[PDB]
Amino acid sequence: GSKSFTCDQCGKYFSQKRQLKSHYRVHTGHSLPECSHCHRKFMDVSQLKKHLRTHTGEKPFTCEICGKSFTAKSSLQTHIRIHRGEKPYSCSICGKCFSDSSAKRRHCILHTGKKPFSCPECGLQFARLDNLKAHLKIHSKEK
Template sequence: CLDCGKSFSESTNLSNHRRIHSGEKPYSCADCGQSFSHRSYLNIHRRTHTGEKPFSCPDCGKSFRQSANLSSHRRIHSGEKPYSCADCGQSFSDKSTLIRHHRTHTGEKPFSCPDCGKSFSQISGLTQHRFTH
């Protein structure tokens, strides 16, 4: 890739990757018009309209639209916590929880109220705050 230097063994993979830089989204949902850079992303999105959840947990039967969500869910049953905080050592079952936790150390508050500018470390804090306006 001329933009970032990443290499690919197949030209189709390079073409798909280049959409990250160009912003091209040639695959559109016929139901809502949302566009996607890859056909596979569109296929996953379509499940929001059809309600299809083809990935089921063998432990509890809960179903998911994406296999990655099932993999994350299965850690609840196994107790696996592969994501550790470099600052305090606390472990988490999914990466997004680690990212949220890490903000307690950094003080980062990436969610800002468009009305008053107050910032929050979690989007839920901003959502709750918005009711005050």
């Protein structure tokens, strides 16, 4: 109030041109925090520090039940639900429940029947890119 500068990518408003220029980095990547190891860029320095653990192998979030360690606290939180049998994610179509939110999301796709991954060698179609990768290894073994 008032804001006269607009981003031509997401439409967000800004009161000063310097504010728009700083925000525009998220679309172009220019001058974003850049990892010195791999030179990929991230939205802020905290996301870069998280990414640094991919190079060091540091896993600072340890499960006190089994002793395994994880790179992110969210992953530890998801892992703890396995020990406690906590399955809060359920498919609304068939009722199958999961402790992992991605396992639930991946399962629900099967009710659509879509198989968008087609083997370039024989044309066999798969709902999962994983199954296509493993399938192509059979062609490599046959050849």
